[PDB]
Each structure stands twice: as structure tokens, then as C-alpha cells.
Amino acid sequence: AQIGPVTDLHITNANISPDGFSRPAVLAGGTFPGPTIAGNTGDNFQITVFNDLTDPSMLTDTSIHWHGLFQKGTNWADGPAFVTQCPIITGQSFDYNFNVPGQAGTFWYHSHLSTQYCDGLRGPFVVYDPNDPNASLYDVDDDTTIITLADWYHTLAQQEPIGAAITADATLINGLGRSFTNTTASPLSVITVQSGKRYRMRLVSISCDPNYLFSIDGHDMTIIEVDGVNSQQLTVDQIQIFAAQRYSFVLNANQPVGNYWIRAQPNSGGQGFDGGINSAILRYEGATVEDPTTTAPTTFSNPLVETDLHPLADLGVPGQPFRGGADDPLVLNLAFANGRFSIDGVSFVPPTVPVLLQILSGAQNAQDLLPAGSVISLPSNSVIEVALPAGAAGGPHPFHLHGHNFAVVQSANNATPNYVNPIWRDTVSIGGTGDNVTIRFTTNNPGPWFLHCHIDWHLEAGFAIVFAEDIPDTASANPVPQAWSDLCPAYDQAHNI
């Protein structure tokens, strides 16, 4: 029941009750999470998104981003509202027509307008590799081995009151889970395995906010992929996974036939597992249909530590092996005050004209681009370093860059940089007070690429900038279809702009 790589995708409003509490939602494909969009490496995806939304309480406009797909030459298809497009208006559709050369792994898709993805528009996106170098490590890799972790709110995203703390009401694993308060014994998700087989579990955080401590009682997990990047095998018994990150891990069904708890503990909201919150069930074929009776350890033996991960391929680190050893070394001042985030003193507020359209219309330095102070130019064919020192309230903040993955030269909670063999990924926790998480990449993808915290509430409150990569070559690199050119006039007419 995967769809794609050529598919329609309808975006609708409907009631759902994933934790036993009914609320309206914004759904792709009629479900929460949305259906898996899938294809093979190098395929042409043609996702015709039909905006059928009618309930203004969750916004009737929409725009969808394909998280972690580089969009080289198709920046117009990337999805962030007012960065690469105007939103699609209700009653209209738009074909996101792009290719995925050179990428294979676990991705996801989500609304990229306001906080709308929190209201339900989120689903997995898998690019399989027919020649996967990890293929011999497992037996099963299909829709039944995708594990999504989601935060779910009873209050609608647009209706979260100004000045009150926002926390979720349930953790949903594969779309099901129990509410933290007024808990009812609603159905839990079941992941089924066969004794003796090995599974490529594709763990996807579709969170709007919390990080999760993910584990499976009785089992360990051998990581083989990080945010689309193949890794050396790393065996862990717990994974702290931040918003928008992905891991593949091998699960060996090597425990007695039975039922085992799957645990996903968020860093906010309900703590523990009373009443079966924060839980799903791993069930072996032939086990009794009953809840697990297993317990977690008090202390995990082998938690994931990001510096333990290393690429499977020889990826190295671009630039020179010291701080500032790049063509364009940056240090961002990431701050929060009075309800707003800022980057180098500027809080992001989406512009009226999308950044890409401003560039195509001839704005040719980043000082000319709106929002003023929110768009930073990057030079072409250059090594970029971005230090992201933590400290701003609401952390740990998982920062994400569109259009690129990056070497994680320095990780959370460890002052030592790695210029030899760090993991590459696309979303990274910047850690805690005093940390200096630092990323590097090379600029080989002209266009405006969003850089932001992936806690959606923080993005909405301004925690973002746009890297206008290679402004001079953006128009030649990214020819735009007529339907894209039609988006802003249609949107602005509908909204009387």
C-alpha cells in the first residue's frame, strides 16, 4: 500500500481519534500518518497534490516539503511556503515533479505552511536502493517495517493560545497511542515479526516538537542509516531521536516468541508508561494476543551517542581540519526572547513574495532579498561551515538544512570536533548550554534553502534563515513550470494581497 513515484495525493479535512479523542485534522491520503510515498533511487517523482481543504481552523491553503530530498535543479518543488513557492489554494492542485539522483534512504513529507503539519499532514517517504550495500544485513524491508513516532495534540495548532506552554497530549507510534491525561485503553500499534528473521526497521520522527527515547524491550538495534546516509553498523539499545530525524536499524527477531514493549519516551508531555502511554507492541508470529509483560532497564547499556556513528562510505569532511577551516565559515547567534526566536538578531517572518520568485525577478544579492536580514548568500562551489552554539530557550533544538546533508563536525554534549569521519545527516540536535554543534557542506546546489529549527512551534516563532546559495546561477539552474508561476497570482488573488 505504498504509493508513487507517480501519484495523486489528496489533502483533506477529517475527524480522527488516534488516542481515543476525536478532533479534526489535515490529512494526506485520508490517514494519519499519511501513506508512504516510495520509489527507487534516481526515480522521477510526480506527486500531484490536490488541496481539498475547507476548514479554516487548520488553514485551507497548503504546501508540501519532501524532507531531505535535495531538489537539485528543482528548487521550486521543495515546498517551504514563501521560500520556494506560494501555497496551493483550496480547490486547486500542483504537480511536484522532481528526481532523486544519488539519494537512497528514509525520508518523510510534511506540510511546510505555518504549523499545519502538526494538524496531521505528515507521512513517510522511502527511496529504496536496488543495489543497497546493506541489503544482506536483513530479510524484510517494506511498509510493515516503517515505524513513525509522532506527537499529537488535542488543541488545534492555530488555536494554541498565545503565552501558554505547548505540550502534546499523546505519543503515537504508527499512528496509535494513548493520551497522557484521561487515558483510555484505545488500541496500540502492533509491529509483527517472525522468529529468526531480520528486519530493516525504518524509524521516522514526524514530530512537531519532542525528541523520543526509543527502545524495544529485550532487543537491541543495529543502526545502518542516519537521515538517508548509510552508516557503519552501530549496535545500541536506545535511540534518542530528534524531530525530523530518521534511522534504519536491523532488528533481529532473536528473542523468545512473545510480546515485547516498544517504548518512545518524549522529552515533554507524559513521563513513563502508565496505562500504556508512550507504547506500542512488538509481537512475534505465534505469540498470544495480549500485552507485553516486559520491563525496561533502569539504565540502558548502549545508548546512541552521535559521535559513535560513522558513514559506511568514505565521505570525509570538506575543508581543513580546524575551526573556521572553510571558504565561508559562519557562526550563527541563535537566541530567544519574549516569545520570538532570532538568528543574528533577526526573527524570521515569511515574506509576501517567495524568496525564489524574488531571485527569479532579478533580486541579485541577499541584501536585496526579503525578509531583510533573514536571507544570507552563499558562494558557489565552496566549503561552508556553520557553527550553531546552543543556549536559546526551548532546546535541545534540532536544526535542519534543506537542499543538503552535512558533516556533523561537532555534536551535542562533546566539545571535540571530528574532521575525519563524522556522520553526515540533515537534522542535528545543537545540544545544551555551551555546546558548539557545527556542520559543513559544499555548495553545489543553486537556490534558496531554508535553515531552521525543526520544532515547528519554534519555526513559527521565527527560528530560521534562508541560505540563498549561488544567487547568480539560481534562475538558470531551476527552470520553473507554468503551474509554479501561477501559484503566487492565484494565492494573492484569493487572499486579496
Ligand X SMILES: *[C@@H]1O[C@H](CO)[C@@H](O[C@@H]2O[C@H](CO)[C@@H](O)[C@H](O)[C@H]2NC(C)=O)[C@H](O)[C@H]1NC(C)=O
Ligand Y SMILES: *[C@@H]1O[C@H](CO)[C@@H](O[C@@H]2O[C@H](CO)[C@@H](O[C@@H]3O[C@H](CO)[C@@H](O)[C@H](O)[C@@H]3O)[C@H](O)[C@H]2NC(C)=O)[C@H](O)[C@H]1NC(C)=O
Which residues contribute to the site for ligand Y (CB under 6 A)?
A: 305, 307, 414, 416, 418
| 154 annotated binding-site participant | no
**Is 495 labeled as catalytic in the residue annotation?**
no
Q: Could you say which of F ion, Cu ion, ligand Y, none residue 414 binds, taking C-beta under 5 to 8 angstroms by partner kind?
A: ligand Y
Residue 170 or 390: the one with the smaller Cβ distance to ligand X is 390
**Is 402 labeled as catalytic in the residue annotation?**
yes
**CB of residue 454 to F ion, shortest distance in Å:** 9
Residue 308 or 368: the one with the smaller Cβ distance to ligand Y is 308
Residue 80 or 318: the one with the smaller Cβ distance to ligand Y is 318
**CB of residue 307 to ligand X, shortest distance in Å:** 17
Which triple of cell numbers denotes residue 171? 505519543
In the 3-class helix/strand/coil scheme, how is the chain assigned residue by residue? Answer: CCECCEEEEEEEEEEECCCCCCEEEEEECCECCCCCEEEECCCEEEEEEEECCCCHHHCCCECEEEECCCCCCCHHHCCCECCCECCECCCCEEEEEEECCCCCEEEEEEECCCCHHHHCCEEEEEEECCCCCCHHHCCECCHHHEEEEEEECCCCHHHCCCCCCCCCCEEEECCECCECCCCCCCCCCEEEECCCCEEEEEEEECCCCCCEEEEECCCCEEEEEECCEEEEEEEECEEEECCCCEEEEEEECCCCCCEEEEEEEECCCCCCCHHHCCEEEEEECCCCCCCCCCCCCCCCCCECCHHHCCECCCCCCCCCCCCCCCCEEEECCEEEECCEEEECCECCCCCCCCHHHHHHCCCCCHHHCCCCCCEEEECCCCEEEEECCCCCCCCCCEEEECCCCEEEEECCCCCCCCCCCCCEECEEECCCCCCCCEEEEECCCCEEEEEEECCHHHHHCCCEEEEEECHHHHHHHCCCCHHHHHHHHHHHHHCCC
Cα distance between residue 124 and residue 404, in whole Å = 19
**CB of residue 67 to Cu ion, shortest distance in Å:** 3
Handedness of CA 75, 80, 122, 394 (dihedral sign): positive
Residue 418 or 427: the one with the smaller Cβ distance to ligand Y is 418
Cα distance between residue 394 and residue 389, in whole Å = 14
**Is 452 labeled as catalytic in the residue annotation?**
yes
| 310 annotated binding-site participant | no
Residue 107 or 247: the one with the smaller Cβ distance to ligand Y is 247
| 208 annotated binding-site participant | no
| 397 annotated binding-site participant | yes
**Is 154 labeled as catalytic in the residue annotation?**
no
Dihedral angle at the C-alpha atoms of 154, 160, 161, 166, nearest 10 degrees? 80
Residue 92 or 429: the one with the smaller Cβ distance to Cu ion is 429
Binding string, residues 41-80; x marks residues near Cu ion by CB under 5 A: --------------------------x-------------
Please name the residue that has the C-alpha cell 513574495: 353
Q: Could you say which of ligand X, ligand Y, Cu ion, none residue 305 binds, taking C-beta under 5 to 8 angstroms by partner kind?
A: ligand Y
C-alpha distance across the termini of the chain, in Å: 41
Catalytic residue among 37, 50, 67, 471: 67
Catalytic residue among 219, 310, 404, 452: 452
| 404 annotated binding-site participant | no
Give the residues lining the site for F ion (CB under 5 A): 67-68, 402
| 452 annotated binding-site participant | yes
**Is 404 labeled as catalytic in the residue annotation?**
no
**CB of residue 144 to F ion, shortest distance in Å:** 26
Residue 404 or 440: the one with the smaller Cβ distance to F ion is 404
Q: Could you say which of ligand Y, F ion, ligand X, none residue 436 binds, taking C-beta under 5 to 8 angstroms by partner kind?
A: ligand X
**CB of residue 197 to Cu ion, shortest distance in Å:** 31
**Is 463 labeled as catalytic in the residue annotation?**
yes
**Is 219 labeled as catalytic in the residue annotation?**
no
**CB of residue 412 to ligand X, shortest distance in Å:** 13
Catalytic residue among 64, 110, 262, 441: 110
Catalytic residue among 376, 463, 471, 488: 463
Q: Hey, which residues between 302 and 331 contact Cu ion (CB under 5 A)?
A: none
Q: Could you say which of Cu ion, ligand X, ligand Y, none residue 402 binds, taking C-beta under 5 to 8 angstroms by partner kind?
A: Cu ion
Catalytic residue among 454, 467, 471, 488: 454
Known binding-site positions: 65, 67, 110, 112, 397, 400, 402, 452-454, 458
Provide the annotated active-site residues: 65, 67, 110, 112, 397, 400, 402, 452-455, 458, 463
Known binding-site positions for Cu(2+): 65, 67, 110, 112, 397, 400, 402, 452-454, 458
Enumerate binding residues for Cu ion (CB under 5 A): 67, 244, 397, 402, 450, 453, 455, 458
